[PDB]
Design an enzyme around this catalytic site. Structure first.
Site, PDB file in Angstrom:
ATOM      1  N   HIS A 134      27.611  16.583  65.602  1.00 40.34           N
ATOM      2  CA  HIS A 134      27.490  15.966  66.919  1.00 40.34           C
ATOM      3  C   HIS A 134      26.469  16.697  67.775  1.00 40.34           C
ATOM      4  O   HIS A 134      26.347  17.911  67.669  1.00 40.34           O
ATOM      5  CB  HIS A 134      28.859  16.097  67.582  1.00 40.34           C
ATOM      6  CG  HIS A 134      29.068  15.201  68.753  1.00 40.34           C
ATOM      7  ND1 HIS A 134      29.122  13.825  68.638  1.00 40.34           N
ATOM      8  CD2 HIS A 134      29.315  15.482  70.050  1.00 40.34           C
ATOM      9  CE1 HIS A 134      29.396  13.301  69.817  1.00 40.34           C
ATOM     10  NE2 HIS A 134      29.517  14.284  70.689  1.00 40.34           N
ATOM     11  N   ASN A 156      29.505  15.751  77.304  1.00 40.42           N
ATOM     12  CA  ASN A 156      29.636  15.004  76.044  1.00 40.42           C
ATOM     13  C   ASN A 156      29.695  13.518  76.387  1.00 40.42           C
ATOM     14  O   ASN A 156      30.041  13.153  77.516  1.00 40.42           O
ATOM     15  CB  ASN A 156      30.914  15.454  75.307  1.00 40.42           C
ATOM     16  CG  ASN A 156      31.174  14.692  74.003  1.00 40.42           C
ATOM     17  OD1 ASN A 156      30.265  14.301  73.289  1.00 40.42           O
ATOM     18  ND2 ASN A 156      32.446  14.526  73.679  1.00 40.42           N
TER      19      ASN A 156
HETATM   20  C1  LIG Z   1      38.046   8.919  64.221  1.00 43.84           C
HETATM   21  O1  LIG Z   1      37.238  10.107  64.454  1.00 43.84           O
HETATM   22  C2  LIG Z   1      36.369  10.580  63.414  1.00 43.84           C
HETATM   23  C3  LIG Z   1      35.078  11.298  63.795  1.00 43.84           C
HETATM   24  O2  LIG Z   1      34.560  12.068  62.980  1.00 43.84           O
HETATM   25  C4  LIG Z   1      34.221  10.633  64.895  1.00 43.84           C
HETATM   26  C5  LIG Z   1      33.294  11.678  65.541  1.00 43.84           C
HETATM   27  C6  LIG Z   1      31.786  11.613  65.295  1.00 43.84           C
HETATM   28  C7  LIG Z   1      31.056  11.252  66.584  1.00 43.84           C
HETATM   29  C8  LIG Z   1      31.290  12.964  64.744  1.00 43.84           C
HETATM   30  N1  LIG Z   1      35.039   9.937  65.902  1.00 43.84           N
HETATM   31  C9  LIG Z   1      35.513  10.518  67.005  1.00 43.84           C
HETATM   32  O3  LIG Z   1      35.302  11.693  67.286  1.00 43.84           O
HETATM   33  C10 LIG Z   1      36.367   9.658  67.940  1.00 43.84           C
HETATM   34  C11 LIG Z   1      35.722   8.280  68.164  1.00 43.84           C
HETATM   35  C12 LIG Z   1      34.563   8.036  69.146  1.00 43.84           C
HETATM   36  C13 LIG Z   1      34.950   8.223  70.619  1.00 43.84           C
HETATM   37  C14 LIG Z   1      33.264   8.766  68.782  1.00 43.84           C
HETATM   38  N2  LIG Z   1      36.584  10.344  69.212  1.00 43.84           N
HETATM   39  C15 LIG Z   1      37.788  10.438  69.774  1.00 43.84           C
HETATM   40  O4  LIG Z   1      38.816   9.953  69.281  1.00 43.84           O
HETATM   41  O5  LIG Z   1      37.742  11.133  70.982  1.00 43.84           O
HETATM   42  C16 LIG Z   1      37.890  10.390  72.186  1.00 43.84           C
HETATM   43  C17 LIG Z   1      39.274  10.209  72.744  1.00 43.84           C
HETATM   44  C18 LIG Z   1      39.471  10.071  74.118  1.00 43.84           C
HETATM   45  C19 LIG Z   1      40.748   9.895  74.647  1.00 43.84           C
HETATM   46  C20 LIG Z   1      41.853   9.855  73.801  1.00 43.84           C
HETATM   47  C21 LIG Z   1      41.671   9.992  72.417  1.00 43.84           C
HETATM   48  C22 LIG Z   1      40.382  10.169  71.899  1.00 43.84           C
END
Ligand SMILES: COC[C@@H](O)[C@H](CC(C)C)NC(=O)[C@H](CC(C)C)NC(=O)OCc1ccccc1
Length: 212
Positions: free
Chosen positions: A159, A175
């Protein structure tokens, strides 16, 4: 350089954006620095186009991650458009640059902060926001929600995000996961642990735009 630094109280940083399914992070990262450098220079704060880098950077991989130093290079050759002018669709669509008129702004250059060195990274942040990378593949980062983040997390940086400030034991990070994550979309990652890599990988690659 001062003890504390929070670019937000200098009227140099704009609201928290969300990136959606797109692996646009790099764009969102590179844009926060451009918005910052220009306000620091000119006196006006304007949102710029993430979609523009996302579509026009030939060296990145669209919604499959990319290189903020190349997108930042992009805005050095040509320039960047305002956000309303070339709004974010969150899908990569062809390079509608020229087809939009004259660019909103252009920067003189791109630059690299000496890596694996928490000191250089502070000298720089004390001038303008900077592009920084970390690791979020983990549950802890994903589930973060306030306070000083320490981990656990590896150093397998993926990221991309921006550093808009610091204090005694933290580096203020903006972020792009909305305002319902962390401290209204922000995260304070701890610094000063001696780790040459920085918590979560925070010191693996750092770049910023030059603007005379
Ligand atoms: C399901 O997650 C797997 C991962 O690897 C990827 C990350 C990638 C960008 C490296 N996905 C995420 O981090 C997810 C989804 C979105 C918001 C990006 N993020 C996330 O769940 O954070 C935001 C969040 C905000 C409020 C309550 C719960 C979650």
């Amino acid at each position: 350089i001062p003890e504390y630094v929070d670019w937000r109280q200098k009227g140099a940083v704009t609201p928290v954006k969300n990136q959606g399914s797109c692996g646009s992070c790099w764009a969102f990262s590179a844009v926060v620095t451009i918005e910052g450098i220009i306000k620091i220079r000119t006196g006006n704060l304007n949102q710029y186009s993430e979609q523009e880098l996302l579509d026009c950077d030939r060296r990145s991989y669209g919604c499959n991650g990319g290189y903020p130093w190349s997108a930042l290079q992009l805005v050095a050759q040509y320039g960047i458009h305002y956000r309303n002018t070339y709004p974010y669709e969150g899908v990569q669509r062809y390079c509608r640059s020229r087809e939009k008129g004259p660019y909103a702004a252009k920067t003189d250059g791109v630059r690299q902060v000496q890596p694996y060195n928490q000191g250089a990274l502070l000298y720089s942040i004390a001038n303008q926001p900077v592009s920084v990378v970390l690791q979020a593949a983990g549950k802890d980062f994903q589930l973060y929600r306030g306070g000083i983040f320490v981990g656990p997390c590896g150093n397998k940086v993926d990221h991309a995000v921006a550093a808009v400030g610091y204090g005694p034991n933290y580096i203020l990070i903006k972020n792009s996961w909305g305002t319902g994550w962390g401290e209204n979309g922000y995260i304070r990652i701890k610094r000063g642990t001696g780790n040459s890599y920085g918590v979560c990988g925070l010191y693996t690659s750092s770049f910023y735009p030059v603007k005379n």
